[PDB]
Amino acid sequence: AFARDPTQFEERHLKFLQQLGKGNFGSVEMCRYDPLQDNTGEVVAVKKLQHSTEEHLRDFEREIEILKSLQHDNIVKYKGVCYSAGRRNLKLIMEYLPYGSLRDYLQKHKERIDHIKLLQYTSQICKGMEYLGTKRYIHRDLATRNILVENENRVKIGDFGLTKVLPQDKEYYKVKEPGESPIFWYAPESLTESKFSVASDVWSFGVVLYELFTYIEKSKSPPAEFMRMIGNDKQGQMIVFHLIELLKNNGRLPRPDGCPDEIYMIMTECWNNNVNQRPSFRDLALRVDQIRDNMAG
Ligand SMILES: CCS(=O)(=O)N1CC(CC#N)(n2cc(-c3nc(Nc4ccc(C5CCN(C)CC5)c(F)c4)nc4[nH]ccc34)cn2)C1
Protein backbone atom coordinates (compact mmCIF):
# COMPACT_ATOMS: atom_id res chain seq x y z
CA ALA A 1 0.00 0.00 0.00
CA PHE A 2 1.08 3.60 -0.58
CA ALA A 3 3.19 4.77 2.37
CA ARG A 4 1.36 8.12 2.24
CA ASP A 5 -1.91 9.66 1.09
CA PRO A 6 -1.82 9.54 -2.73
CA THR A 7 -4.62 12.10 -3.16
CA GLN A 8 -3.02 14.93 -1.20
CA PHE A 9 -0.70 16.21 -3.97
CA GLU A 10 -2.09 15.34 -7.40
CA GLU A 11 0.50 15.61 -10.15
CA ARG A 12 -1.75 17.59 -12.51
CA HIS A 13 -1.90 20.51 -10.03
CA LEU A 14 1.82 20.49 -9.18
CA LYS A 15 3.44 23.15 -11.38
CA PHE A 16 7.19 23.54 -11.86
CA LEU A 17 8.62 27.00 -11.21
CA GLN A 18 12.41 26.82 -10.80
CA GLN A 19 15.27 24.44 -10.09
CA LEU A 20 16.68 24.87 -6.56
CA GLY A 21 19.37 22.20 -6.32
CA LYS A 22 20.64 19.33 -8.38
CA GLY A 23 23.07 16.46 -7.97
CA ASN A 24 23.92 13.30 -9.84
CA PHE A 25 21.09 11.29 -8.26
CA GLY A 26 18.49 13.82 -7.12
CA SER A 27 17.19 17.32 -7.63
CA VAL A 28 14.98 19.74 -5.75
CA GLU A 29 12.58 22.04 -7.57
CA MET A 30 10.42 24.94 -6.49
CA CYS A 31 6.81 24.23 -7.49
CA ARG A 32 3.36 25.67 -6.85
CA TYR A 33 0.48 23.43 -5.79
CA ASP A 34 -2.65 25.05 -7.21
CA PRO A 35 -5.60 22.66 -6.93
CA LEU A 36 -8.17 25.49 -7.16
CA GLN A 37 -6.45 27.11 -10.20
CA ASP A 38 -6.72 30.28 -8.08
CA ASN A 39 -4.56 32.32 -5.71
CA THR A 40 -5.06 29.52 -3.14
CA GLY A 41 -1.80 27.84 -4.12
CA GLU A 42 1.22 27.17 -1.92
CA VAL A 43 4.85 27.20 -3.02
CA VAL A 44 6.62 23.97 -2.07
CA ALA A 45 9.95 22.21 -2.58
CA VAL A 46 9.88 18.91 -4.48
CA LYS A 47 12.66 16.34 -4.40
CA LYS A 48 12.90 13.86 -7.24
CA LEU A 49 15.41 11.26 -8.35
CA GLN A 50 17.74 11.64 -11.31
CA HIS A 51 19.17 8.59 -13.06
CA SER A 52 16.77 6.46 -11.04
CA THR A 53 16.97 2.69 -10.58
CA GLU A 54 15.00 0.13 -8.55
CA GLU A 55 17.77 0.35 -5.92
CA HIS A 56 17.60 4.14 -5.80
CA LEU A 57 13.79 4.13 -5.63
CA ARG A 58 13.91 1.72 -2.68
CA ASP A 59 16.43 3.97 -0.93
CA PHE A 60 14.24 7.01 -1.68
CA GLU A 61 11.22 5.35 -0.08
CA ARG A 62 13.34 4.78 3.03
CA GLU A 63 14.44 8.44 2.97
CA ILE A 64 10.83 9.63 2.71
CA GLU A 65 9.85 7.44 5.65
CA ILE A 66 12.74 8.92 7.64
CA LEU A 67 11.74 12.51 6.88
CA LYS A 68 8.05 11.89 7.59
CA SER A 69 8.98 10.47 11.00
CA LEU A 70 10.78 13.69 12.01
CA GLN A 71 9.01 16.70 13.54
CA HIS A 72 11.38 19.33 14.91
CA ASP A 73 12.00 23.06 14.54
CA ASN A 74 15.45 22.43 13.01
CA ILE A 75 14.45 19.73 10.50
CA VAL A 76 12.79 20.65 7.21
CA LYS A 77 9.08 19.90 7.23
CA TYR A 78 7.70 16.93 5.30
CA LYS A 79 4.43 17.80 3.55
CA GLY A 80 3.64 14.68 1.54
CA VAL A 81 4.38 12.60 -1.55
CA CYS A 82 3.26 13.01 -5.15
CA TYR A 83 2.69 9.65 -6.84
CA SER A 84 3.27 10.95 -10.32
CA ALA A 85 3.33 9.20 -13.69
CA GLY A 86 -0.04 7.64 -12.94
CA ARG A 87 1.10 6.48 -9.47
CA ARG A 88 4.15 4.77 -10.99
CA ASN A 89 6.76 7.21 -9.60
CA LEU A 90 7.49 9.07 -6.38
CA LYS A 91 8.34 12.68 -5.56
CA LEU A 92 8.81 14.08 -2.04
CA ILE A 93 7.00 17.30 -1.13
CA MET A 94 8.51 19.57 1.53
CA GLU A 95 8.16 23.12 2.78
CA TYR A 96 10.02 25.70 0.74
CA LEU A 97 12.66 27.54 2.79
CA PRO A 98 13.15 30.98 1.27
CA TYR A 99 16.90 31.58 1.83
CA GLY A 100 18.26 28.35 0.39
CA SER A 101 21.32 26.47 1.52
CA LEU A 102 23.39 27.74 4.42
CA ARG A 103 26.52 27.27 2.30
CA ASP A 104 25.30 29.85 -0.21
CA TYR A 105 23.68 32.07 2.43
CA LEU A 106 26.94 32.40 4.36
CA GLN A 107 28.69 33.61 1.23
CA LYS A 108 25.94 36.00 0.19
CA HIS A 109 25.42 37.47 3.67
CA LYS A 110 28.74 37.02 5.40
CA GLU A 111 28.95 40.79 5.99
CA ARG A 112 25.95 40.63 8.36
CA ILE A 113 26.85 37.32 10.06
CA ASP A 114 29.06 37.61 13.17
CA HIS A 115 30.31 34.96 15.62
CA ILE A 116 27.20 34.97 17.77
CA LYS A 117 25.06 34.37 14.67
CA LEU A 118 27.31 31.50 13.59
CA LEU A 119 26.88 30.03 17.07
CA GLN A 120 23.09 30.35 16.84
CA TYR A 121 23.22 28.29 13.63
CA THR A 122 25.61 25.81 15.28
CA SER A 123 23.20 25.39 18.23
CA GLN A 124 20.26 24.75 15.91
CA ILE A 125 22.10 22.14 13.87
CA CYS A 126 23.12 20.43 17.13
CA LYS A 127 19.52 20.33 18.36
CA GLY A 128 18.33 18.82 15.07
CA MET A 129 21.01 16.17 15.51
CA GLU A 130 20.04 15.48 19.14
CA TYR A 131 16.55 14.83 17.82
CA LEU A 132 17.77 12.53 15.03
CA GLY A 133 19.73 10.47 17.56
CA THR A 134 16.60 9.83 19.60
CA LYS A 135 15.28 7.99 16.51
CA ARG A 136 18.60 6.07 16.15
CA TYR A 137 19.16 7.73 12.79
CA ILE A 138 22.70 8.39 11.53
CA HIS A 139 22.75 11.30 9.11
CA ARG A 140 26.08 10.52 7.35
CA ASP A 141 26.10 13.74 5.24
CA LEU A 142 26.26 16.68 7.62
CA ALA A 143 27.64 19.66 5.70
CA THR A 144 26.59 23.25 5.16
CA ARG A 145 25.35 22.34 1.67
CA ASN A 146 22.67 20.20 3.42
CA ILE A 147 21.49 22.86 5.87
CA LEU A 148 18.77 25.28 4.80
CA VAL A 149 17.86 28.77 5.94
CA GLU A 150 14.27 29.70 6.79
CA ASN A 151 15.06 33.24 7.92
CA GLU A 152 17.97 35.09 9.54
CA ASN A 153 17.26 33.39 12.89
CA ARG A 154 16.39 29.82 11.84
CA VAL A 155 18.19 27.02 10.00
CA LYS A 156 17.09 23.44 9.45
CA ILE A 157 18.71 20.20 8.40
CA GLY A 158 17.48 19.91 4.85
CA ASP A 159 18.36 16.58 3.31
CA PHE A 160 18.44 12.97 4.50
CA GLY A 161 19.55 11.12 1.36
CA LEU A 162 22.34 9.18 3.12
CA THR A 163 20.59 8.75 6.49
CA LYS A 164 20.53 5.22 7.92
CA VAL A 165 18.75 3.61 10.87
CA LEU A 166 20.97 1.83 13.37
CA PRO A 167 20.43 -1.93 13.72
CA GLN A 168 18.61 -2.80 16.91
CA ASP A 169 21.55 -4.36 18.75
CA LYS A 170 24.49 -2.14 17.82
CA GLU A 171 25.66 1.44 17.92
CA TYR A 172 27.09 1.60 14.42
CA TYR A 173 25.94 0.96 10.85
CA LYS A 174 28.50 -0.68 8.53
CA VAL A 175 28.03 0.48 4.92
CA LYS A 176 28.79 -2.13 2.30
CA GLU A 177 29.05 -0.57 -1.16
CA PRO A 178 29.13 3.22 -0.71
CA GLY A 179 27.55 5.57 -3.18
CA GLU A 180 28.55 9.22 -2.97
CA SER A 181 31.12 9.51 -0.18
CA PRO A 182 31.95 13.03 1.12
CA ILE A 183 35.30 11.79 2.36
CA PHE A 184 36.57 15.17 3.62
CA TRP A 185 33.76 15.18 6.18
CA TYR A 186 34.23 11.55 7.25
CA ALA A 187 35.49 10.28 10.59
CA PRO A 188 38.60 8.05 10.42
CA GLU A 189 36.68 4.88 11.33
CA SER A 190 34.23 5.57 8.49
CA LEU A 191 37.19 5.71 6.07
CA THR A 192 38.96 2.66 7.50
CA GLU A 193 36.08 0.42 8.66
CA SER A 194 32.97 1.79 6.88
CA LYS A 195 31.43 2.36 10.33
CA PHE A 196 28.95 5.18 10.87
CA SER A 197 27.53 6.17 14.23
CA VAL A 198 26.26 9.10 16.25
CA ALA A 199 29.94 9.73 17.04
CA SER A 200 30.88 9.90 13.35
CA ASP A 201 28.08 12.43 12.90
CA VAL A 202 29.77 14.42 15.74
CA TRP A 203 33.07 14.30 13.80
CA SER A 204 31.30 15.63 10.71
CA PHE A 205 29.60 18.30 12.84
CA GLY A 206 33.06 19.50 13.74
CA VAL A 207 33.71 19.93 10.03
CA VAL A 208 30.42 21.87 9.68
CA LEU A 209 31.57 24.16 12.53
CA TYR A 210 34.83 24.71 10.65
CA GLU A 211 32.88 25.48 7.47
CA LEU A 212 30.76 28.08 9.29
CA PHE A 213 33.81 29.91 10.65
CA THR A 214 35.43 30.01 7.19
CA TYR A 215 32.34 31.75 5.75
CA ILE A 216 32.89 29.42 2.74
CA GLU A 217 35.78 31.63 1.63
CA LYS A 218 37.55 30.57 -1.53
CA SER A 219 40.24 27.95 -0.93
CA LYS A 220 39.23 27.33 2.72
CA SER A 221 36.80 24.46 2.10
CA PRO A 222 37.59 21.07 3.67
CA PRO A 223 38.46 19.53 0.26
CA ALA A 224 40.71 22.42 -0.70
CA GLU A 225 42.51 22.41 2.67
CA PHE A 226 42.95 18.67 2.89
CA MET A 227 44.20 18.58 -0.72
CA ARG A 228 46.69 21.37 -0.01
CA MET A 229 48.02 19.31 2.92
CA ILE A 230 48.05 15.99 1.03
CA GLY A 231 49.36 17.36 -2.26
CA ASN A 232 47.24 18.83 -5.03
CA ASP A 233 48.84 16.72 -7.77
CA LYS A 234 47.70 13.50 -6.14
CA GLN A 235 44.76 11.67 -7.57
CA GLY A 236 42.73 8.55 -7.10
CA GLN A 237 42.85 6.25 -4.12
CA MET A 238 46.22 7.66 -3.13
CA ILE A 239 44.30 10.69 -1.86
CA VAL A 240 42.29 8.47 0.48
CA PHE A 241 45.42 6.64 1.62
CA HIS A 242 47.07 9.95 2.49
CA LEU A 243 43.91 11.28 4.14
CA ILE A 244 43.74 8.24 6.42
CA GLU A 245 47.42 8.57 7.35
CA LEU A 246 47.00 12.29 7.93
CA LEU A 247 44.01 11.93 10.23
CA LYS A 248 45.32 8.97 12.20
CA ASN A 249 48.39 11.02 13.17
CA ASN A 250 46.59 14.18 14.23
CA GLY A 251 46.50 16.16 10.98
CA ARG A 252 43.54 18.52 11.07
CA LEU A 253 41.92 21.41 9.30
CA PRO A 254 43.42 24.71 10.49
CA ARG A 255 41.81 27.29 12.71
CA PRO A 256 39.90 29.61 10.33
CA ASP A 257 40.97 33.23 10.15
CA GLY A 258 39.36 35.16 13.00
CA CYS A 259 38.01 32.03 14.72
CA PRO A 260 38.23 32.21 18.52
CA ASP A 261 40.43 29.61 20.17
CA GLU A 262 37.53 28.30 22.25
CA ILE A 263 35.52 27.53 19.12
CA TYR A 264 38.50 25.85 17.48
CA MET A 265 38.80 23.76 20.65
CA ILE A 266 35.24 22.54 20.15
CA MET A 267 36.11 21.49 16.56
CA THR A 268 39.21 19.67 17.76
CA GLU A 269 37.23 17.82 20.47
CA CYS A 270 34.77 16.61 17.83
CA TRP A 271 37.77 15.46 15.75
CA ASN A 272 38.96 12.88 18.29
CA ASN A 273 40.22 9.60 16.83
CA ASN A 274 38.90 7.95 20.02
CA VAL A 275 35.24 7.51 19.09
CA ASN A 276 33.96 7.28 22.66
CA GLN A 277 35.77 10.46 23.74
CA ARG A 278 33.92 12.71 21.27
CA PRO A 279 31.31 14.94 22.95
CA SER A 280 27.62 14.23 22.53
CA PHE A 281 25.29 16.54 20.63
CA ARG A 282 23.65 17.38 23.98
CA ASP A 283 27.07 18.41 25.39
CA LEU A 284 27.72 20.52 22.31
CA ALA A 285 24.36 22.29 22.29
CA LEU A 286 24.74 23.27 25.93
CA ARG A 287 28.33 24.39 25.52
CA VAL A 288 27.56 26.54 22.47
CA ASP A 289 24.45 28.06 24.03
CA GLN A 290 26.42 28.91 27.19
CA ILE A 291 29.11 30.58 25.08
CA ARG A 292 26.47 32.65 23.29
CA ASP A 293 24.68 33.48 26.51
CA ASN A 294 27.89 34.60 28.24
CA MET A 295 28.58 37.12 25.44
CA ALA A 296 27.29 40.68 25.87
CA GLY A 297 30.06 43.11 24.89
C1 LIG B 1 22.39 17.30 -4.47
C2 LIG B 1 21.14 16.42 -4.40
S3 LIG B 1 19.70 17.48 -4.17
O4 LIG B 1 19.55 18.42 -5.26
O5 LIG B 1 18.46 16.76 -4.03
N6 LIG B 1 20.01 18.41 -2.82
C7 LIG B 1 19.11 18.68 -1.69
C8 LIG B 1 19.71 20.03 -1.62
C9 LIG B 1 20.64 20.27 -0.42
C10 LIG B 1 19.88 20.41 0.89
N11 LIG B 1 19.26 20.52 1.85
N12 LIG B 1 18.78 21.12 -1.73
C13 LIG B 1 17.62 21.26 -1.08
C14 LIG B 1 17.13 22.50 -1.45
C15 LIG B 1 15.89 23.22 -0.94
N16 LIG B 1 15.86 24.52 -1.17
C17 LIG B 1 14.89 25.27 -0.68
N18 LIG B 1 14.81 26.66 -0.98
C19 LIG B 1 15.70 27.47 -1.78
C20 LIG B 1 15.41 28.83 -1.84
C21 LIG B 1 16.21 29.71 -2.58
C22 LIG B 1 17.34 29.20 -3.23
C23 LIG B 1 18.36 30.02 -4.05
C24 LIG B 1 18.82 31.00 -3.09
C25 LIG B 1 19.88 31.93 -3.69
N26 LIG B 1 20.27 31.48 -5.01
C27 LIG B 1 21.12 32.22 -5.46
C28 LIG B 1 19.15 31.38 -5.91
C29 LIG B 1 17.98 30.58 -5.32
C30 LIG B 1 17.60 27.84 -3.16
F31 LIG B 1 18.70 27.31 -3.77
C32 LIG B 1 16.81 26.97 -2.44
N33 LIG B 1 13.90 24.81 0.07
C34 LIG B 1 13.88 23.47 0.34
N35 LIG B 1 13.02 22.75 1.07
C36 LIG B 1 13.40 21.48 1.09
C37 LIG B 1 14.58 21.33 0.34
C38 LIG B 1 14.90 22.63 -0.13
C39 LIG B 1 18.09 23.13 -2.24
N40 LIG B 1 19.09 22.26 -2.43
C41 LIG B 1 20.51 19.79 -2.82
> Domain spans of the chain?
11-95, 102-291
Cα–Cα distance between 193 and 97 in angstroms, integer? 36
Q: Which protein residues are within 6 Å of ligand 1, measured from CB?
A: 20-23, 26-28, 45, 47, 76, 94-98, 100-101, 104, 145-146, 148, 158-159
Cα–Cα distance between 140 and 97 in angstroms, integer? 22
Report the first-to-last Cα separation within the chain, whole angstroms: 58
Closest to 68 measured CA to CA, from 5, 7, 110: 5
What technique solved it? X-ray
Cα–Cα distance between 1 and 228 in angstroms, integer? 51
Confirm if 204 and 152 have CB atoms less than 8 A apart.
no
Cα–Cα distance between 279 and 206 in angstroms, integer? 10
Q: Which residue among 94, 108, 146, 148 is best mutated to probe the pocket of ligand 1, counting the most ligand atoms within 8 A of its Cβ?
A: 148
Closest to 178 measured CA to CA, from 21, 20, 25, 22: 25
Ligand 1, atom 41: closest residue by C-alpha:
21
Asked, colleague to colleague, whether 11-95 and 102-291 share their fold, the answer is no
Catalytic residue among 38, 59, 141, 169: 141
Distance of CA 282 to the CA centre of its chain: 18
The answer to whether 289 is a known catalytic residue is no
What CATH number does the domain located at 102-291 have? Answer: 1.10.510.10
C-alpha count within 13 angstroms, C-beta hemisphere, residue 28: 19
- Ligand 1: which atom is nearest the Cα of residue 47? 5
Q: Which residue among 101, 109, 149, 157 is best mutated to probe the pocket of ligand 1, counting the most ligand atoms within 8 A of its Cβ?
A: 101
Cα–Cα distance between 296 and 251 in angstroms, integer? 35
The DSSP output letter for 9 is S
Instruction: Enumerate the known binding-site residues for ATP.
Output: 20-28, 47
Resolution in A: 1.3
C-beta contacts of 151-155 below 8 A and 24+ residues apart: 151/98, 151/99, 152/99, 152/112, 152/117, 153/120, 154/73, 154/74, 154/124, 155/74, 155/102, 155/121, 155/124, 155/125
Instruction: Decide which of 2.60.40.10, 3.40.50.300, 2.60.40.1930, 3.30.200.20 is the CATH code for 11-95.
Output: 3.30.200.20
The helix (H) or strand (E) run that includes residue 27 is strand 26-33
